[model samples]
Target: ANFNVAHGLAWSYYIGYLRLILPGLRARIQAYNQRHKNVLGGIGNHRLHILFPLDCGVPDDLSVADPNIRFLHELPQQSADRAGIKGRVYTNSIYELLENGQPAGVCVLEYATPLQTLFAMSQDGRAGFSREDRLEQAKLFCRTLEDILADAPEAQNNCRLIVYQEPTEGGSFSLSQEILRHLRQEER
Candidate 1:
């Protein structure tokens, strides 16, 4: 299990991706990084968004693949934030919202800044410096994430995955306790 609310921990969690599984995807990430290496430092931007962690997901067994799925290679200082897309998500969070909220908390996402997209696509030479071209990239980015997360486990199965971020040496005492308190109360 990637998330254990009973224990209040999610281990070896991985989110997002900058590296690609396909040669085309790989080349896109590589070329983008290469072009922006002077400023973006290769894959660091992706790390900022926490993408393509080779050993991503829960590290229980050799093949806890479902627990460790990440979407794609991303950007550092990701100008894109949850203002549009609500950051990396977990099943518990998704269920709580979709099942509870009126609209599910913005459903917003940020994958890349204009500059990142522009520069990255600049290398591809597929887009011109026009609003229409830039929007095409935005559309593409959204579609990719939609496919990656929307069709995946957490979004599909109401899986047990949860996002509880803490350096759990003492375990998630504060978070866990507070959660249990509010958890027991069960209010909105």
Candidate 2:
């Protein structure tokens, strides 16, 4: 008897992870913020867009234990069915494209110069001589993101989760989305 606005589940609208039964996953998002606080505060460079609102049209009496469901904007999760991981993923207004037009595990990348420039600047780190250090941190951040996607949802199998930066070429970056496409290929 509950309804979720952000993710309207099939059969019933109350299958999301907000019910009294589900305690929900609590990640220390503050850690990420704090880790990149100085860098982000300066140029707001280390921010990834997670397009989910905590209370998006969902009733209080719902419970979906799947960690794949992100309730907060900073809480990361894969986009659901038919969801668009396309068009301006970040502030750079870049679009999504799979390599060789091949689809796999939810892959998308920022191929445009504006996007790469933003990434480069952001990865360059805070001020002064710490630029290299910041860039290294950025690489680790991206690596962590890949790891997160690999383990999230808890339902995904031993799937290969790889993300690419598009290399100045247009292609998808999501490892999961690309895997899905590959799976489909074998099925065909």
Candidate 3:
């Protein structure tokens, strides 16, 4: 019942473009590895790739994300939970988006899930991040997203134009705003 209600509540308002966040994702992976550290007496790889939800179906004609990415799980949902959402780790992509100061791929439909991209600082790929550094960068990125949203709170989108709005690169804010519009519209 707890999971159901939690899941229901998130699904209720979350448009498909739910964010999977960055640092929290790494922390969750590390914690899980810690819990089973001595299990097999074998070292387990302490890395987890950002899983992009590409396969999940979208309601609108626009492609973005889905509720499988959203969960009220008291325990943070780990990579295994989203095992199906394996997206190739995109490094510096979000950086490009930010540098563009505006808006912005994958094979076939993988990159088409709207702003479902991930980021990494410099050339250090997602797999090559230290805990402290990762957390710091995560805070900066999310905060950057918040600022962008605050910057354009009103008259941001037209009904269908938003669908065709260029995909934002590293900054998933472009996509996040899509859901923002979605969430606000449903309120009225």
lDDT of 2 by residue, 17-45 (tens): 21211122222233444554466321112
Q: How close is candidate 3 to the true structure, as a TM-score?
A: 0.22
Candidate 3 residue 73 Cα shift, in angstroms, is: 27
All candidates' lDDT scores?
0.29, 0.28, 0.29
| Stretches of model 1 off by over 4 angstroms after superposition | 1-115, 118-129, 155-188
Per-residue lDDT of 160 in model 1: 16
For candidate 3, write residues 1-188 as lDDT tens digits.
Answer: 11112222223212332233333434554554466446712112222212222222222322324221221112234342344667533221110111133321110011222222222231245444444443344334334433443443331221111232233364343443443353345345
| Candidate that would win on TM-score | 2
- Candidate 1 is scored at a TM of 0.22
Q: Determine which window of 10 residues in candidate 2 has minimal summed lDDT.
A: 53-62
In candidate 2, position 115 carries an lDDT of 21
